[PDB]
Design a protein around this ligand. Structure first.
Ligand code: CLA
Ligand code: CLA
Ligand code: CLA
Ligand code: CLA
Ligand code: CLA
Ligand code: CLA
Ligand code: CLA
Ligand code: LHG
Ligand code: 5X6
Ligand code: BCR
Ligand code: PQN
Ligand code: SF4
Ligand code: SF4
Lengths: 80, 61, 38, 158, 74, 741, 73, 117
């Protein structure tokens, strides 16, 4: 599976979660930023590693990071 | 002591603007991890010109 | 004034400057042909 | 030196002159004296003579072609040294006035707009001020205005 | 001809490999903390100076070598 | 129902927006922060349906832009006529068509480039032209420079009028959407008005000007001594001397005694033994027959008077039990999408350019074209390339339709929907056919190379070993040879001497003769079948999977043109429809390169050449095609290596520009590989170090330097690949054929 | 011999440029400041931040091979 | 069958024409709808379409295992993932920024990654 990590500079903009075509990510309550919420990656077993989440992340550098890992039927996006 | 308009030098190495001078837009009063929003003239590789920093990552220039 | 702003656009000034440059070099080679040294 | 001789005294060089005239005359033979074809080919024949006479003073290889010396020897200054100095004067001018204009644009309200839509009066001002660029550049260097400080330039993590 | 060509292609493969393992070294084995302010760390410190000057000499050689050949061809 | 409706003074004529680069785009109007903006400005300038959501505003830009294109074409044509008038040996060439080389470009004496002013004859020195303009102008009856000058001036006036009309129909009188959607009216006018009256009015020129001028030229009258065209119209006795039917006037036309015009309107077939061109009395009659067909055809579609067909009713009627709702929706598709129309129109115009290439070499329509081998080779090759580019474009716009304009509601169980619903069956079968064709076409060459290299000539696919006779093509040649007096009873000769019958010579040079098809011809035809099927695979796959695949289920949302959807799913580089077009271009280049090489070699080997007084044909490459063109080594050695001799030996001659362009084109081709093989990540990182050096000297630009986009890298790559590859062949071909032809 | 030696110098310097840039940017760049976390060889970092094809130090090896072959040529 | 399948259920008031993620026009029933899809991404791509075009919010995506197990996937908590919801525990958080990640040298011949603090 791929590894998806959320770093503390997340501003809780929700753009990564909206961008994810596999529903890997969700917004969770968090006091660390003014938005009152942080990206979370609970379903990385479904992550294809498309990095649409990183493309969407406005922080410099990225608050969400995708480390491509061991390939599976799911991660390779295979319908056979 | 940063406020809206203060000039700050960036100390965050992975920042597009490391060593550059930005302008403080706002300093968040509430206890947040990265409260200082800093704006730059140069856009980064995503075409954005602002991001939030901790006080330790800024030098008032 | 808008036409002058257009004529100040990168490609127009580049075209005109390189035309002028090319003209000078062409005309120097017309009048001083085969200059292999000073 | 047997490898290089003065082109004036080089038989291969004279042979090349003769060959180039002969080829032009072999073409000219198919035209009738007063014709444009004849006069055009005659013009080229006249310039062949003028060229080979001009290059006579150069050193020639055994190929009978002018070979340029670029080692700093003043006897060959006209071949490289003088053209080299002229090149650096012109391009130093281009670079200097370009830097001057670029520095002007960064003081304006929309610096990027002044890079794609030139302030022609300001461009002309800096372009006409390039003629003493080596002194201008020296004065900026001495005054600590030429170079940005290492502190102020963005770099990637090492 | 065979031997000159054979050995220059081997030499070429070897120097590309040398630099490949140089790059791999920097990712996998290089510890900045254990090389603080030494000659190796100082290379990374002015990498932009090194790359920009190699870019300059490459451009210079390319423009003038291609330039002179094309002058000669024309 | 069919009405003219325009909006007046819709756009003010102001330079304001000229001084605002990227005014047309909401994304670009704000101006540059990076160099990417400069490229984007140009990439997006004509993508009108990205600028605005209004189909009306898109339509009006298109109509006005079209006038811009015609204005430019008129400047170019005008140029060709003016260069003919002012800088050409055309007048001299008319008096010695076989001896003088056409020339209409003179270079200035500077840096020694006057070497390119070749000894072409006719009392000038200049570049030998291969456009066939002289043969066109001779067929048109042009005999003097005044006629060419006046055509050039006329061209500039048409260019001016096109510019006025483009300006006028955008700024002053812009037609409404409902004007443009009059497809029935448009087709009636374009069929009857453009093609019908074009052909009728041209037939008029031919009968009144071309025919009499060319009859006198072919008799050997001095072009200066020929009466000016208007004298044939004014003095009917002059015309009656040449074509006696002109005694009876127009009475035989209105009374249906049409056989009286047997002199001016013929069905001779074959070629003039004098000019090696089609009989102009055949061409005049062709154009009359076509004109009638088109004027009749353009009465098909209903406009304002009840009579005529609804194209909507026609499409919806063509419904069978195997194809669901059939052609339901396609009328809506083609009246609401410019891209859908551009897709069809490019496919057909491109395919037409290719048909023109084949018909024009084999039935040489212009006098002294057939034996001007440079022109024959140039015209075939040129029209092949234009055709290839247009067909790939059809793929691009078909796919743009699928991404931007396609709706499931319009295309519900219609032929388009049903195609998408078995795209897997379509692409799997076409994939298979490509592997079958590739193995059994290219494999025969590799088999042959292997057998010849192993000293096994008796084990080869060849005319002298294992024969692959194109028996169906051979059989069709026979039928076309037997046609005149038989299945074409009133035809005196074959449509083309390519099929059989006689060898036509003009002077000593072969105009046309039977093109015999053997094993080498069978093999190269299956290569063409192969390269076309693969190109179709790439472009069709692009269209049918433009909106989604099993890999990218939401591909339509990512758009027509996007680099990838990231390295996940194993890697999704070049999934976009745009990337299929990108790959399609290389295969089109591959396919057409082999077509024009097949043409060049076959014509030189087996057709073009000299016929002696004895009457023995000596071909340019002496029949080496049959035994050399059945191996790749034969193509490398007997074609590229042997025929490149002219271009590489061109230095110090008038053909030296071809030598230079041969190397220049190789350079540009190779340079392309830098863009195609690399990725912008490398380049953006390099630029960072270069930007550092500029920052150090306080000379870094405010418009931040960026590596080209991933897509632009590909666009630059394929553009330089094609420019380099095509220009290389151009220099090769022209140097070769101007020397040996 | 003068001209081709400058061709050889061009090839040595450019091949060196690619390989040295590869080595000195292997750990990270402004475009990918955490590149060392992805290792020597990886496809890219996706189409974000302008696009990142051939950003890995391995990709510099791949590009340098063309220049090495060209130069030895 | 041999591999995992995805069932997508939704309700519609009207018989909307929609685009299958496998290509081509379909008509959803004015009532309950059930599609079987090979990939979670196909189901979500259709769900995006249903939500954006037809304002259908009641879609449910399931994973069918070849064993016969049915796992409800989306929306996991009943609320869409981009709307912050109580009861969701953070997964994948790393403290500080990417800049604080260690060198591969420091983590060589260990289970740890550079981002493992
Ligand atoms: C763009 C820069 C440029 C410059 C600096 C010059 C400069 C000159 N031109 Mg040239 N000229 C140019 C472009 C230029 N020309 C172009 C583009 C054309 C083609 C239209 C000409 C056609 C031309 C002609 C026909 C003549 C000149 C002549 C001259 C000389 C007049 C004194 C002067 C050296 C004149 C001259 O002195 O030569 C005999 C002359 O008769 N020029
Ligand atoms: C890249 C390097 C390069 C260099 C160093 C040269 C150098 C030269 N070329 Mg070549 N050439 C090149 C590339 C190059 N070229 C390319 C790429 C092509 C193909 C387009 C050519 C095609 C070419 C031709 C066809 C000819 C030349 C000629 C020349 C000579 C021109 C002298 C001149 O213009 O008058 C003197 C010009 C000046 C002194 C400039 C003065 C500038 C201002 C006005 C001075 C202001 C005062 C401060 C010079 C030796 C000509 C020659 O005579 O060869 C012997 C010639 O006929 N070049
Ligand atoms: C004022 C403009 C200017 C100045 C002073 C410099 C200066 C420099 N460049 Mg840069 N460069 C420029 C423009 C400029 N450049 C532009 C427009 C480009 C994009 C093509 C580059 C691309 C570039 C690269 C890729 C590299 C350099 C490098 C360098 C450095 C080494 C010398 C060299 O290679 O120059 C020669 C530069 C070139 C051949 C590039 C083109 C130069 C253009 C044509 C000049 C444009 C002039 C401008 C339009 C004038 C307008 C002024 C007017 C409005 C008043 C030196 C700091 C090298 C370096 O980093 O060395 C350490 C290096 O590798 N430059
Ligand atoms: C013939 C093939 C070809 C050519 C000419 C180039 C040229 C270049 N490469 Mg590339 N490269 C190639 C193939 C080629 N490459 C291939 C197949 C690959 C593998 C993917 C690469 C991968 C590669 C990498 C990884 C790098 C290079 C770099 C370079 C630059 C090296 C320095 C130099 O020579 O500057 C002089 C420039 C040239 C010789 C280019 C041509 C300049 C022309 C002649 C000027 C034309 C002006 C003229 C007026 C015409 C204008 C046309 C008009 C339409 C506007 C140079 C731009 C390096 C670089 O950028 O260093 C700074 C670099 O890091 N290349
Ligand atoms: C004569 C004066 C004139 C003026 C002042 C205007 C003014 C305007 N036009 Mg109009 N228009 C005109 C004539 C004029 N037009 C003509 C003759 C036509 C028929 C082609 C049109 C058709 C037209 C269309 C379809 C549109 C406009 C639009 C506009 C607006 C934006 C234009 C812009 O940014 O262009 C600056 C662009 C150029 C200077 C490039 C022009 C390129 C020409 C046509 C072809 C170049 C030849 C060839 C390809 C060159 C190759 C060279 C080589 C180096 C490769 C602006 C209000 C646009 C708009 O959005 O209005 C609301 C719009 O969509 N115009
Ligand atoms: C007889 C009627 C007629 C004719 C001849 C044409 C001809 C043309 N139309 Mg069409 N058009 C017509 C009716 C006609 N249209 C009607 C009724 C509609 C609305 C239903 C349209 C809607 C339409 C659109 C939307 C477009 C066209 C376009 C075109 C051009 C296609 C490109 C081409 O083949 O250039 C061939 C070029 C020539 C033959 C040279 C120019 C010819 C000029 C325009 C005058 C021709 C007619 C005139 C009466 C001739 C007088 C003869 C003289 C001896 C007295 C072509 C000029 C396209 C275009 O390019 O527009 C600019 C385009 O986009 N037309
Ligand atoms: C010489 C260069 C070359 C070759 C051989 C190939 C081969 C192929 N391309 Mg590729 N292509 C190329 C260049 C090439 N391409 C380039 C430069 C590009 C970038 C533009 C592409 C981009 C591209 C695309 C986008 C597509 C292709 C496709 C194809 C396949 C076409 C179907 C086919 O004929 O398969 C059969 C194989 C051949 C004809 C090659 C040789 C066959 C030999 C002679 C016979 C069999 C030999 C035997 C089995 C060997 C046993 C020996 C072993 C035991 C040691 C074929 C595998 C298409 C495809 O996949 O179609 C289904 C496709 O869609 N190519
Ligand atoms: C042309 C011949 C086409 C024969 C297909 C048969 C044909 O013409 O049938 C056409 C047949 C007609 O269906 P309908 O009667 O419903 O058509 C009514 C029409 O008005 C709607 O299109 O439609 C089909 O069954 C779809 C075609 C599938 C055919 C699959 C094979 C396709 C590959 C063909 C390979 C040979 C190509 C040789 C080219 C030289
Ligand atoms: C001024 C200004 C500019 C500033 C550029 C500034 C910073 C340049 C920095 C240079 C660096 C720091 C070291 C330079 C090192 C100089 C080298 C080491 C040259 C050695 C000489 C050789 C060795 C010639 C030998 C020989 C000669 C003697 C005679 C020949 O015949 C034989 C050979 C064998 C060729 C710009 C860029 C903004 C543009 C603007 O436009 C003007
Ligand atoms: C002339 C002469 C002489 C002298 C000489 C000399 C002195 C030489 C030198 C030489 C040299 C001096 C050489 C050099 C070379 C080098 C090289 C070839 C390099 C390489 C490198 C690399 C590849 C690297 C890599 C890496 C990296 C990148 C980083 C990390 C680590 C490493 C290191 C691995 C004599 C007197 C004896 C004799 C006579 C003549
Ligand atoms: C070489 C290369 C580059 C580098 C090339 C770049 C950035 C383009 C070079 C820009 C040229 C030189 C034009 C810039 C000139 C300025 C407009 C200044 C003009 C000055 C006068 C002539 C007027 C990429 O960015 C790239 C991206 C993706 C895949 C492959 C590649 C690739 O192969
Ligand atoms: S896009 Fe980036 S900043 Fe926004 S919620 Fe996701 S990780 Fe946080
Ligand atoms: S290599 Fe380039 S095109 Fe391929 S997935 Fe990565 S970013 Fe996209």
């Amino acid at each position: 599976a791929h590894t998806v990590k959320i770093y503390d500079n997340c501003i809780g903009c929700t753009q990564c979660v909206r961008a994810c075509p596999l529903d890997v990510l969700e917004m969770v309550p968090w006091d660390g930023c003014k938005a009152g919420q942080m990206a979370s990656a609970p379903r990385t077993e479904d992550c294809v590693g498309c990095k649409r989440c990183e493309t969407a992340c406005p922080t410099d550098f990225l608050s969400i990071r995708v480390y491509l890992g061991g390939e599976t039927t799911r991660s390779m996006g295979l319908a056979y | 002591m940063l406020k809206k308009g203060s000039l700050v030098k960036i100390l965050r190495p992975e920042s597009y603007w490391f060593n550059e001078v930005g302008t403080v837009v706002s300093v968040e009063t509430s206890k947040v991890l990265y409260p200082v929003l800093v704006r730059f003239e140069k856009v980064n590789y995503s075409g954005l010109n602002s991001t939030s920093f901790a006080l330790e990552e800024l030098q008032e220039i | 004034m808008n036409l002058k702003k257009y004529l100040s656009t990168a490609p127009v000034v580049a075209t005109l400057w390189l035309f002028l440059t090319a003209g000078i070099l062409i005309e120097l080679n017309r009048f001083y042909p085969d200059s292999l040294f000073y | 030196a047997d490898v290089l001789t003065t082109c004036q005294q080089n038989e291969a060089f004279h042979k090349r002159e003769a060959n180039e005239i002969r080829q032009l005359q072999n073409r000219q033979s198919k035209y009738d004296a007063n014709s444009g074809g004849y006069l055009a080919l005659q013009a080229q024949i006249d310039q062949v003579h003028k060229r080979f006479d001009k290059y006579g003073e150069l050193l020639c290889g055994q190929d009978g072609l002018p070979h340029l010396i670029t080692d700093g020897d003043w006897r060959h200054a006209r071949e490289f040294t003088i053209p080299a100095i002229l090149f650096l004067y012109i391009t130093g001018w281009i670079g200097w006035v370009g830097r001057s204009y670029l520095q002007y644009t960064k003081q304006t309200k929309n610096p990027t707009e002044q890079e794609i839509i030139l302030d022609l009066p300001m461009a002309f001002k800096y372009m006409l001020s390039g003629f003493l660029w080596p002194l201008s550049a020296w004065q900026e260097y001495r005054s600590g205005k030429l170079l940005a400080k290492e502190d102020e330039i963005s770099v990637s993590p090492r | 001809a065979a031997l000159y060509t054979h050995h220059q292609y081997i030499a070429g493969l070897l120097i590309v490999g040398a630099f490949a393992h140089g790059a791999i070294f920097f990712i996998r084995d290089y510890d900045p903390e254990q090389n603080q302010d030494n000659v190796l760390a100082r290379m990374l410190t002015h990498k932009e100076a090194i790359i920009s000057h190699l870019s300059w000499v490459s451009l210079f050689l390319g423009f003038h070598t291609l330039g002179l050949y094309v002058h000669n061809d024309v | 129902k069919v009405k003219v409706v325009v909006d007046r003074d819709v756009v003010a004529t102001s330079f304001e927006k000229w001084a605002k680069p990227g005014h047309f785009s909401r994304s670009l109007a704000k101006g540059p922060k990076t160099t990417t903006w400069i490229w984007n400005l140009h990439a997006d300038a004509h993508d009108f349906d990205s600028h605005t959501s209004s189909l009306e505003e898109v339509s009006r830009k298109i109509f006005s832009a079209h006038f811009g294109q015609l204005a430019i074409i008129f400047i170019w044509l005008s140029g060709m006529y003016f260069h003919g008038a002012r800088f050409s040996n055309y007048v001299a060439w008319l008096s010695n068509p076989t001896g003088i080389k056409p020339s209409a470009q003179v270079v200035w004496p500077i840096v020694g480039q006057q070497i390119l002013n070749a000894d072409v004859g006719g009392g000038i020195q200049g570049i030998q032209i291969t456009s066939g303009l002289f043969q066109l102008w001779r067929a048109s009856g042009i005999v003097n420079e005044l006629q060419l000058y006046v055509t050039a001036i006329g061209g500039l006036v048409m260019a001016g009028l096109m510019m006025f009309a483009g300006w006028f129909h955008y700024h002053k009188a812009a037609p409404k959407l409902e004007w443009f959607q009059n497809v029935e009216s448009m087709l009636n006018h374009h069929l009857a008005g453009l093609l019908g009256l074009g052909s009728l009015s041209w037939a008029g020129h031919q009968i009144h000007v071309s025919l009499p001028v060319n009859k006198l030229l072919d008799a050997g009258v001095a072009p200066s001594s020929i009466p000016l065209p208007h004298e044939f119209i004014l003095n009917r006795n002059l015309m009656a001397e040449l074509y006696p039917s002109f005694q009876q006037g127009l009475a035989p036309f209105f009374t249906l005694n049409w056989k009286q015009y047997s002199d001016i309107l013929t069905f001779k077939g074959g070629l003039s033994p004098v000019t090696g061109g089609l009989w102009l009395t055949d061409v005049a009659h062709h154009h009359l027959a076509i004109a009638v067909l088109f004027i009749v055809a353009g009465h098909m579609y209903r406009t304002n008077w009840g009579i005529g067909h609804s194209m909507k009713q026609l499409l919806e009627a063509h419904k069978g039990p195997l194809t669901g709702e059939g052609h339901k929706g396609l009328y809506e598709v083609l009246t609401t999408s410019w891209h859908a129309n551009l897709a069809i129109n490019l496919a057909m115009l491109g395919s037409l350019s290719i048909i023109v290439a084949h018909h024009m070499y084999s039935m040489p329509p212009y006098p002294y074209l057939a034996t001007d081998y440079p022109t024959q080779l140039s015209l075939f090759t040129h029209h092949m390339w234009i055709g290839g580019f247009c067909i790939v474009g059809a793929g691009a716009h078909a796919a743009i339709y699928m991404v931007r304009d396609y709706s499931p509601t319009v295309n519900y169980n219609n032929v388009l929907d049903r195609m998408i619903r078995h795209r897997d069956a379509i692409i799997s079968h076409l994939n298979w056919v490509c592997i079958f064709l590739g193995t059994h076409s290219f494999g025969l060459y590799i088999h042959n190379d292997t057998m010849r290299a192993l000293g096994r000539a008796q084990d080869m696919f060849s005319d002298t070993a294992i024969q692959l006779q194109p028996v169906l093509a051979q059989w069709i040649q026979q039928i076309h040879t037997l046609a005149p007096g038989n299945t074409a009873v009133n035809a005196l000769a074959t449509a083309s001497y390519a099929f059989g019958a006689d060898t036509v010579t003009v002077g000593s040079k072969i105009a046309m003769m039977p093109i015999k098809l053997g094993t080498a011809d069978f093999m190269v035809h299956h290569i063409h079948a192969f390269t076309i099927h693969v190109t179709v695979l790439i472009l069709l796959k692009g269209v049918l999977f433009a909106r989604n695949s099993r890999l990218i289920p939401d591909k339509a949302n990512l758009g027509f043109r996007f680099p990838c959807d990231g390295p996940g799913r194993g890697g999704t580089c070049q999934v976009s429809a745009w990337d299929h077009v990108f790959l399609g271009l290389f295969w089109m280049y591959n396919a057409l390169s082999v077509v024009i090489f097949h043409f060049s070699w076959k014509m030189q080997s087996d057709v073009w050449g000299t016929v002696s007084s004895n009457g023995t044909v000596s071909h340019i490459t002496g029949g080496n095609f049959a035994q050399s063109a059945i191996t790749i080594n034969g193509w490398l050695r007997d074609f590229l290596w042997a025929q490149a001799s002219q271009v590489i030996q061109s230095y110090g001659s008038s053909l030296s520009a071809y030598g230079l362009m041969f190397l220049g084109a190789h350079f540009v081709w190779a340079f392309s590989l830098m863009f195609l093989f690399s990725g912008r990540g490398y380049w953006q990182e390099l630029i960072e170090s270069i930007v550092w050096a500029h920052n150090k000297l306080k000379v870094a630009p405010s418009i931040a330097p960026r590596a080209l986009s991933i897509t632009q890298g590909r666009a630059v790559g394929v553009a330089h690949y094609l420019l380099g590859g095509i220009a290389t062949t151009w220099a090769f071909f022209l140097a070769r054929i101007i020397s040996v032809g | 011999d003068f001209l081709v030696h400058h061709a050889i110098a061009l090839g040595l310097h450019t091949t060196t440029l690619i390989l040295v840039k590869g080595a000195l940017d292997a750990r990270g760049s402004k475009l990918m400041p955490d590149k060392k976390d992805f290792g020597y060889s990886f496809p890219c970092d996706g189409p974000g931040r302008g696009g990142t094809c051939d950003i890995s130090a391995w990709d510099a090896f791949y590009l340098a091979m063309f220049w090495m072959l060209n130069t030895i040529g | 069958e041999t591999e995992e399948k995805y069932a997508m259920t939704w309700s519609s008031n009207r018989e909307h024409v929609f685009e299958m993620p496998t290509g081509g026009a379909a008509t959803m029933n004015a009532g309950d709808n059930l599609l079987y899809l090979a990939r979670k991404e196909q189901a979500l791509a259709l769900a995006t379409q249903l939500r954006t075009q037809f304002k259908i919010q009641d879609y449910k995506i399931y994973r069918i295992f070849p064993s016969g197990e049915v796992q409800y996937l989306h929306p996991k908590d009943g609320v869409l993932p981009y709307l912050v919801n109580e009861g969701r525990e953070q997964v994948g958080r790393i403290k500080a920024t990417i800049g604080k990640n260690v060198n591969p040298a420091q983590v060589k011949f260990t289970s740890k990654a550079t981002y493992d603090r």
